[PDB]
Each structure stands twice: as structure tokens, then as C-alpha cells.
Design a protein around this ligand. Sequence first.
Ligand SMILES: CCCCCCCCCCCCCC(=O)O
Ligand SMILES: CCCCCCCCCCCCCC(=O)O
Ligand SMILES: O=C(O)c1cc(I)cc(I)c1O
Length: 581
Amino acid sequence: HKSEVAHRFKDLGEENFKALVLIAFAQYLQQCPFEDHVKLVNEVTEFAKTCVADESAENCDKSLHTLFGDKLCTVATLRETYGEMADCCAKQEPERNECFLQHKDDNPNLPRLVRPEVDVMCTAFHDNEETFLKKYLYEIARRHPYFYAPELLFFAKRYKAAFTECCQAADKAACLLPKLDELRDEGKASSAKQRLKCASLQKFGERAFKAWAVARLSQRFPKAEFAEVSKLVTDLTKVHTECCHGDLLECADDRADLAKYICENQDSISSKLKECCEKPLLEKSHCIAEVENDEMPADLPSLAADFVESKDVCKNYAEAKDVFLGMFLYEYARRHPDYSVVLLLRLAKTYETTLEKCCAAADPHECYAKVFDEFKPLVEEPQNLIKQNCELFEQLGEYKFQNALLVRYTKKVPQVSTPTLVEVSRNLGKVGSKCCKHPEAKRMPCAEDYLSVVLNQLCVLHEKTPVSDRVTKCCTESLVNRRPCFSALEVDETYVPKEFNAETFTFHADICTLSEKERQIKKQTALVELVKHKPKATKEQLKAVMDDFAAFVEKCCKADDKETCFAEEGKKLVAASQAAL
Ligand SMILES: CCCCCCCCCCCCCC(=O)O
Ligand SMILES: CCCCCCCCCCCCCC(=O)O
Ligand SMILES: O=C(O)c1cc(I)cc(I)c1O
């Protein structure tokens, strides 16, 4: 490999290459117009071809970091448009590249993307497919500078597949919309997860990150040996550190490597890793990351043998603490792919604590004897929450369920902004739909997965505009205590009911013309405000007031002269209701 560009060009292929250079340039020069990046992609692509034909052609020998930075520094508007960023072209490549990552605005001042009408999109998609998907890839890229490019390209192809299909259908809207909403959520879900892992790494450091990775990789690869798992974690830890820093190339190569490794040692790691290892370069790592858990060996011993009933536990521990605990996790995780990762960590931390007490006691073995017994309540806590909640969800569907949460949390944290409470309660309700569909054994992992994102978003918002110390407590706790902390919140008996507002409970006939989406939002907002004005209201009281309301809306959105039924009958409701409470 004399020419780095020629090599990448050959591994990737024209199409992928061009999409990637586009994304790459958009993530740095987020303020330049589309036509400008397009010209650049062609210049870079014409260059890459020159090197595919002769690796001795000028500059073909230069490294990607150099080629990229040099190209970047040719833009004449640079100085005027990015200013300080232009000062980076005064440094030598080593730091020049570093200077660029520093001026990568994570959340720029660009308008939110508006989804056009299905027909507008389908037609544009037909008249000129390429510039249609590239214009958007550009739009998305400039807005999410740290999103892993290949991951982005992966999303694009699913978008292209949704149009090719749906845009030929009799009723396009009915086909496309549902697909455009699935992707949106996955993209947003995927992004939040990346930002979250990097935050976690930064905040709690490498040790906690590796512990987390040990548990997750063990549940996934129960067959692999601890020596293999440690090796994987180290590599995985070095990978995220590098991808979190923001350097795309570095990140790409580290992942590529790790993916090649895992494949070569496939038999030694996991069985369900075949296909993944067959896919093209760009997809290998993405596939592996989402690989399904392998089956755990049927011939596995009792943990209590090597971690409790054995003597010399303290010796093996003292010799290499983290290694020993690392082992306990590995042994406890691959036997429990049904536990959440933080639950496994919660146990490990408990084992750690007792070993740190017991090993310094008279008779250690007899001290850490009934330690497994201390795990029990830690395991049941989350299991009961799942049974308890999904049972409720099975009764009243998603919407009514979202309502029960609405009443539950508004009573626990009144000070929170009504629109904020509606937002989270709704998302939480979705997690219920998504995870309660699974068999008992996958529910916890599923909920841990969705809750982590929602809980994080919640804390960020509260960080910016604080409202409750409790929420700040829970939010600044260890990532292992975060959720149990929020589950420990109790009804706020300090709160003083807000002043009744007639306006707040006045509804017009427009709610009849609104979409189920709006109706719900409108109603749920009134529901929250109801709890804020009379938080001491029983679930019985609320239920009755809610039913009446149901009728109300119905019996008004089906009557002659709608606008009067909502003014006469409503005043009645608001009076009848006020009295009941
Ligand atoms: C390979 C490293 C394994 C280390 C095992 C330590 C397990 C303790 C739980 C990890 C969380 C540490 C942060 C905390 O105290 O909450
Ligand atoms: C003083 C109280 C004024 C009465 C206003 C009641 C508003 C409650 C909203 C109930 C909406 C529940 C939605 C539903 O029935 O599906
Ligand atoms: O999720 C990842 O980023 C990831 C990437 C590679 I490459 C291998 C494994 I296992 C992973 O979990």
C-alpha cells in the first residue's frame, strides 16, 4: 500500500467512497453550501482515480490526514466563514488535524429539517435520485458532526430503500410515513447512545467503562474465554476513546482491525458470528455490534465454588483485584443474558464491597459466606418493576398507560414543566410497548436499553434549567444508581397546589379536527395541570373526572353547532368537577 487513497478507494468502491468524502467534509465545513461540497467530492474522487491507476502519481503517497487537511485549507471563504478555524492552516499536520477537531461545532445554529410532502419527496426522488439523497445526507451530516459516518451511510441506504419501495405504491403516504418515522427514531436513538457512551467514558473513566464492557461482552459471548474477553474489552475501550475524540480515520481503522480480529477468531468467540464476518468491510463491524447473544454452555459450574465456597479467595483477590472482579462479572454475566448490565455491575460492586470488608477480618471465609444472599433483593427490585409495570400496560393500552405514568410522576415531581412531563411520560410509555412484547428473559435488557437514553435526556434538560434537588441528586449519582434513585422518588408532600386557571381547562371544537396525536397531547397536558392543581386527588377521583371528560369531548364533537357544546357543557364540567375535588 504505497497510496492510502488508492487502497481505501479499492476497499470501499466508488459509490461508498463518494458518499463518505461528502459526509466527512460536511462534518467539518458545516457552513458551506451543498454545491461547494459536491465540487470537492468530484475533485477528491478524480484524484483517487489518478492514484488507482498509478500509485506513484503526485501526492498519492501523502497520508489521508494530510490530503484532507490540505484540501480543507484551500477553501478561500474559510477565513471569512469559519475565522479561527482558518488559523489551523498555519500549523503542521500533527496539530493541524487536532486544531480542526477542536472547532467542530457539536450543535450548530441551523434550522430544523422540515419533512416535505410525500409527493414532493417521491417526485424529486424520481427526477434526480442522486442529488436528492446527497442533498439530504449533507443536511443530516452538517447537523451531526460526531455521528460515525459509516453508520450514517448505513442509514441512508435504508432511506433509499424506503423510497424505491413506497414511492411506486398506490398510496405512497400510507407506505412511506410509517417508514420515515421508524428510521427517525432509530437515528435519534442511535445518536443519543453514541453521545451517551462518550459522556460515560469521560465522566466515570476507563475502569467503569471496561467493567461495563466486560459484562456486556460476556452475556453476548458466553462461550469465549476470559482471556479473550479481556482482550476484546481493551480493544473496544481503545476504540470508543478514539471515536469519541472525533477523529474519523483513526476510529475507522481501529474498528476495522477489531472486526478482522474477531472474525479470524470466530470459533473462539461466538458461533452466531458467521454472516457478519461474511458481509462487506463497511458492514462487518456494524453487524457484529448488533450480533445476537450466543447460547451459553450447558456444562457450567456454580459461581459459589470459585467465589464463595473456595478458600484462597482473598489471596486470588489481593493478587489482582480488578482482574478477579473482572472474572466474577464474566462468570456472572454469561450465565445471565437476561440481566441488565447495570444490574450485573450492581452485584459486582456488592461483591467488591464485601471482599474489602471480609478479607481484612479474622475468619474471612466465614465472613463472605452468605454473600450471594445479598444479591437476591438487588435482582428482584428490577424484576418486580418489570412485572408490575408491564402487567399494567397489558390492561390499559399505551395511551391509557401513558396517562397512569403522567399522574404518577407529576405527583412525584410537580415542579417539573408540564410539557416536559408529557414528553417523558410518553416516551416511557413507548418503552413499555417496545419491551413488554418480549418474553420475560429479554425485557430487562430491553428496558435498560431504552431507559438509559430517556433518563439521560431528562437530566440534560434539568441540568440547563434545574427545578428539583432530588432530580439533580438522582442525575448526579453513579450511573449504576441513577435509575433506582428515580424509582425511589416519592410523592412530593411539600408542593403547594398551583392557582386554579379557568383558561387551562377550556377546550374548543378544534380538538375534533386534530389528529389523534394532537388530541392526546392536548388532553394529557390538561391531565398534568389537573394533578398540579389538586395533587391530593385520589386515583378514584381522577378516574371519574377523566371519564366525564371523555364523554364531554365525544358528546361535543358529534353535536350540531360544536362550538356551543364546548362552552356550555364545559362550564358545567369545570363546575361539577371543581366540586367533586
Ligand atoms: C476489568 C475491570 C473490572 C472492574 C470491576 C469493578 C466492578 C465495580 C462496578 C463498576 C463501577 C465502578 C464505579 C462505581 O463505583 O459505581
Ligand atoms: C378543575 C378540573 C377541570 C376538569 C378538566 C379535566 C381535564 C382532564 C383531562 C382528561 C383527559 C383524559 C384523556 C382520556 O379520557 O382519554
Ligand atoms: O459496538 C461497538 O462499537 C462494537 C464494535 C466492534 I469492531 C466490535 C464490538 I463486540 C462492538 O460492540
